[PDB]
Each structure stands twice: as C-alpha cells, then as structure tokens.
C-alpha cells in the first residue's frame, strides 16, 4: 500500500514518500524543529530524466576549462576540460590514470562556477526548482524561506543551486576516504540525488559497496531497500546534530595531537574540512564523547534535508550527480546570526 511516510535510523529519521504531497509540512515541521535531518524519496520520478545524464553534460559543456580533485590524496588536477571528467563517469577504461596506472577517483570542483547555474543551465534550473519538496521552505521566494527577508546581521546564502559531481570510491582502502570531508553550513540545505552511474569494465564492485554500508552503521530497514526493492544507492552520509559540533571539535583536536599535528588549542577542525570520520573515529565519538549521528544511504531521487549548523560528511558508493539548494528556515535562523 501507498503510505505518507516511514522511519529509518530505528525511528530517528523521518522518510516522506510523496515529494508533492501538500500535507508533508504537518509531519516535517515537528522533526525539523528538533534539529533532525529528513529524507524525501521519489524526486527522480518528477524530473525530466534526459536533462540529468552524464553524456548530455559532456556534449553541451565539454569544452569548458575546470579543475578536478583526486579524492584519494586531495591533489588538484589543474586546467583540464570538463569532458575529461564526464567521459570517465561510468566507463572506467576512459578515466585519467594516476602514476601507479590505476584509474583515479575524481571530483569535479566548483562547476558550474559560483552562482552561474541558472545562466548556464536555464532548463535544468526550472526542472529542479519546480519539483523540490517542502516548497514553502525550499523555493527562493517561499513563505518559510527567510533568505530574501533578512538584514546584514545574518549571513545570507549565495544564489544556487550548486552541483556536486564525483566518481564512486572503489577499494577496501577507499572505505576510510571522504568524497567530502566533515564540515558544516550556516544555512539549511536540500540535496537531491538526480543520477547514479553504476560503472562497467570493472563491473562487479558490488560486494565492497555492501561492506561499506554495513561498516558505515546503516540500519536493517535501509539494507532492505537494496535486497528487496532493487533501488540504486548513490552515497553514504553521516550527519550530526548542531548541538554536538563542539564535542566533535574536542575529539578531532585530541586525534590531531596524537597524530603529531601541531595546532593551537582553539583551531577549528570542522571549518578546516580536513577530516573524514571512519569506523574507528565514529566509534570513539560514541564511546568517549557520548555523541550519536545519523548514517543515511541516499538512493536515486532521495532529497536529504541538512539542518543549519549540523556537521556532515559524504562518501559516494557509485558515481553521483547531486544538486542542492540553500534556504533559511525560521526554526534554524539563530545559526546564521552574526552576534552573541
Ligand atoms: C551533495 C553530496 O555530495 C557531496 O559532495 C557532498 C556535499 C554534500 C553536502 N555538503 C557538501 C558536499
Ligand atoms: Cl538548531
Ligand atoms: Cl539547461
Ligand atoms: Cl511546504
Ligand atoms: Cl572535502
Ligand atoms: Mn555541506
């Protein structure tokens, strides 16, 4: 039977089932006020699927100059063509190779650049903005989005949306690496999975994906979406409540010291965006500091709602195209205020 919602993370995470249900706000706002993330499934079924394919981006934009990042060592690949990224997205035999002769796991940096998404891609902009869930919160002019309404005493988000394009991590060693390291954002955001690319040539990398989800602390109900419904898993997230950010900084200062980093006692390891919490670090955070997070697997068409101030990290399981919009809900406006 169709139902309005269900729960993940053993009851701790709301999952809304119909992205365009006009009554979603009634269920959403109780969980959101408590500082929880929220998942909304099914957004892919609302979009024009031909606008969100890797081959389209390569054909239309391939001659643009860009920088890439090597996810394994954070090295910058400077001034290459955007087609050099897109043509290796799924076909492993086309990827740029490291000195060791292995295909690299790459992230496309700052593309489209700054605020240029709407000017560069007007049809994609319209397709995304008209199908975002919780539109009173997420649309630029929604009634519960304060972004356009606040004075300079508040940090205002840039005009969006922003795209996050990166290959999947592959090996046992890659399990300890981020696509994106732990950080936080002073505005709320909604992040939509618009495409998942499951590669070929090295096609059988499915068993290491199960061990990553299992060791990532994914709940038993999340594991059923793979084995029973055959949905495409894109990325593993860890999100932490905004109230736990300082305890996380204390853990990362202690580990920085143990590893022989030489850091002033007040430096900010979350703002530095230099850490990925692997299985060892997530267990130490729980045991030593009493902090529990949310382990979320984002499938094709899932929208992840990230509360302002909440630390989060992302580990792509397969190649992903994600598009995110920032907003300022009244529930979390304190996080962007510039005083006390
Ligand atoms: C969108 C998921 O893909 C990422 O790169 C992670 C990302 C998500 C949230 N904040 C920054 C980056
Ligand atoms: Cl809060
Ligand atoms: Cl477009
Ligand atoms: Cl709404
Ligand atoms: Cl990062
Ligand atoms: Mn973020």
Protein model, in words:
This protein is an alpha+beta fold and 340 residues long. It has one domain: Cupin (Jelly Rolls). The protein is built from ten helices and 14 strands. The protein has helices at residues 24-33, 54-61, 82-86, 117-120, 122-129, 135-138, 206-215, 220-227, 245-258, 279-289; strands at 5-8, 13-16, 38-40, 65-70, 76-81, 106-108, 162-166, 180-183, 188-197, 233-239, 294-299, 303-306, 312-316, 319-327. The strands form two sheets. The chain has a ten-stranded mixed beta sheet. Strands 8-13-10-11 form a four-stranded antiparallel beta sheet, with no helix packed on it. A hairpin with a 5-residue loop joins strand 4 (65-70) and strand 5 (76-81). The protein is globular and about 50 Å long. It starts with a strand and ends in a 13-residue tail after the last strand. 39% of the residues are buried. The chain binds ethyl 2-pyridin-4-ylethanoate (S3S), chloride ion (4 copies) and manganese (II) ion (MN). Residues 121-124 line the site of one chloride ion. It is classed as oxidoreductase/oxidoreductase inhibitor. Keywords: SGC - Diamond I04-1 fragment screening, PanDDA, XChemExplorer, OXIDOREDUCTASE-OXIDOREDUCTASE INHIBITOR complex. The assembly is monomeric.
């Amino acid at each position: 039977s169709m139902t309005s919602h269900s729960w993940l993370c053993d009851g701790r995470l709301l999952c809304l089932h119909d992205p365009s249900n006009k009554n979603n706000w009634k269920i959403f706002r109780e969980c959101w006020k408590q500082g929880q993330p929220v998942l909304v499934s099914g957004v892919h079924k609302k979009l024009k699927s031909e606008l969100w394919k890797p081959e389209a981006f390569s054909q239309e934009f391939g001659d643009q100059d860009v920088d890439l990042v090597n996810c394994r060592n954070c090295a910058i690949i400077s001034d290459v063509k955007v087609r050099d990224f897109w043509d290796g997205f799924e076909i492993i035999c086309k990827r740029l190779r490291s000195e060791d002769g292995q295909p690299m796991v790459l992230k496309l940096k700052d593309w489209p650049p700054g605020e240029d998404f709407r000017d560069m891609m007007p049809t994609r902009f319209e397709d995304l903005m008209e199908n975002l869930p919780l539109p009173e919160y997420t649309k630029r002019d929604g009634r519960l989005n304060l972004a356009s309404r606040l004075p300079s005493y508040f940090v205002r988000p840039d005009l969006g949306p922003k795209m996050y394009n990166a290959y999947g991590l592959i090996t046992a060693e890659d399990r300890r690496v981020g696509t994106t390291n732990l950080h936080l954002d002073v505005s709320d955001a909604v992040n939509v999975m618009v495409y998942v690319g499951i590669p070929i040539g090295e096609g059988a990398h499915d068993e290491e994906v199960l061990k990553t989800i299992d060791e990532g602390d994914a709940d038993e109900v999340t594991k059923e979406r793979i084995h029973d419904h055959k949905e495409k898993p894109g990325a593993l997230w860890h999100i932490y409540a905004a109230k736990d950010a300082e305890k996380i900084r204390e853990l990362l200062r202690k580990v920085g010291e143990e590893q022989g980093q030489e850091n002033p006692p007040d430096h900010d390891p979350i703002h530095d965006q230099s850490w990925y919490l692997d299985q060892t670090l997530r267990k130490r955070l729980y045991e030593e500091y009493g902090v529990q997070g949310w382990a979320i697997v984002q499938f094709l068409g899932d929208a992840v709602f990230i509360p302002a101030g909440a630390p989060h990290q992302v580990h792509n399981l397969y190649s992903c195209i994600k598009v995110a919009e920032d907003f300022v809900s009244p529930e979390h406006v304190k996080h962007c205020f510039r005083l006390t």
